[PDB]
């Protein structure tokens, strides 16, 4: 199935990510997705954005005690975290996840959107595309039919429902609102520089629009001489 | 011959004198300015990539945090050694008093 198009705002050429949503999607990840998924490469410092400034990130940074700190022997989980603390992990070992995921693996979702062909869409679709299995459906273990899912046997447990959680902003927590919002966050994290870049690209387009006709005019100055040269053959 | 053929008409290409030259220079000037503008930006960020009677230390902030009861070339002063009962740096012989003040040697501060 080829996921159809979707009108993501940030995707606008010169427009950028809506941090508010991003924030909302980070909440969604913290309250739902972090039980099997973790933004390993993302740190509270990485988490910083209009969605969450370092200050807010600090709150979240202090909001966790899992594997943030080690003990006399650095085993298990022994102390809470701070700004530099990287995102907590639902599992201290791959086996742990495997164990708590039907034996399957709940992938950390740091670069998940980048990873999936048409990720942003896929994500939205998968989280909200279980649809209906009309026939020949034998979900073996903790699977969930989803035509959007490659095998319609996602096993990514559908973790979002109307008012699955409660957005602190108060925006109605409808499955879709929730899905779209977290999507933004996930996208934001996958490319912490999406906004940064697009500003460069705008400056690059303005500079090239200034510089291309001027360099063309120089070239046509120094090449006019020849382009006007008139040759004449005058055999004696 | 020498005079049979007069210079052909280039008016088609001919432009209507220093003013013309100035304009053309102005163009080169602006373009050079554009190149330079980009240069400061590119080079800066380009370079930017490479950018980021006893003593006890806890390596606070990646540096030895001496706590007690080298200004010269950066070695570790050795506590409880030296001619000033404070510190001594085996690198070049700087003797620090208990206050950590450089008293003898080549350590600057």
């Amino acid at each position: 199935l080829h996921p159809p198009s979707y009108p993501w705002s940030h995707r606008g050429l010169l427009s950028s990510l809506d941090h508010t949503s991003i924030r909302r999607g980070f909440q969604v990840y913290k309250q739902v997705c972090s039980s099997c998924h973790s933004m390993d490469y993302v740190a509270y410092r990485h988490l910083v954005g209009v969605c969450y400034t370092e200050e807010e990130a600090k709150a979240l940074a202090e909001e966790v005690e899992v594997q943030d700190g080690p003990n006399d022997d650095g085993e298990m989980f022994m102390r809470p975290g701070k700004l530099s603390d990287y995102f907590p992990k639902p599992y201290p070992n791959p086996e742990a996840a495997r164990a708590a995921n039907n034996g399957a693996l709940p992938p950390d979702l740091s670069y998940i959107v980048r990873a999936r062909h048409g990720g942003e869409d896929y994500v939205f679709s998968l989280l909200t595309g279980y649809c209906e299995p009309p026939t020949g459906v034998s979900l073996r273990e903790g699977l969930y039919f989803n035509p959007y899912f490659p095998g319609q046997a996602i096993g990514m447990a559908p973790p979002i429902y109307t008012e699955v959680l409660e957005y602190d902003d108060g925006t109605p927590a409808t499955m879709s609102q929730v899905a779209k919002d977290v999507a933004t966050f996930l996208r934001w994290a996958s490319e912490p520089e999406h906004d940064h870049r697009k500003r460069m690209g705008l400056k690059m387009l303005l500079m090239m629009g200034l510089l291309l006709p001027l360099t063309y005019a120089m070239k046509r100055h120094k090449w006019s001489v020849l382009k006007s040269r008139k040759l004449a053959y005058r055999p004696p | 011959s020498h005079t049979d053929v007069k210079v052909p008409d280039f008016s088609d290409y001919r432009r209507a004198s220093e003013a013309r030259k100035g304009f053309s220079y102005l163009v080169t000037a602006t373009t050079t300015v554009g190149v330079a503008y980009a240069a400061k930006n590119v080079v800066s960020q380009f370079v930017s990539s490479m950018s980021a009677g006893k003593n006890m230390a806890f390596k606070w902030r990646g540096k030895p945090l001496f706590v007690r009861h080298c200004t010269h070339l950066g070695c570790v002063p050795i506590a409880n050694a030296g001619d000033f009962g404070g510190y001594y740096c085996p690198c070049h012989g700087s003797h620090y008093d208990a206050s950590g003040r450089i008293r003898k040697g080549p350590a600057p501060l």
Partner: peptide
């Protein structure tokens, strides 16, 4: 003047950077 040409240009690039940045 050629030298001033470069000079004003260097200064032009100088300020343009700030403005464009």
């Amino acid at each position: 003047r050629t030298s001033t040409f470069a000079l004003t240009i260097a200064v032009g690039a100088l300020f343009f950077e700030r403005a464009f940045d």
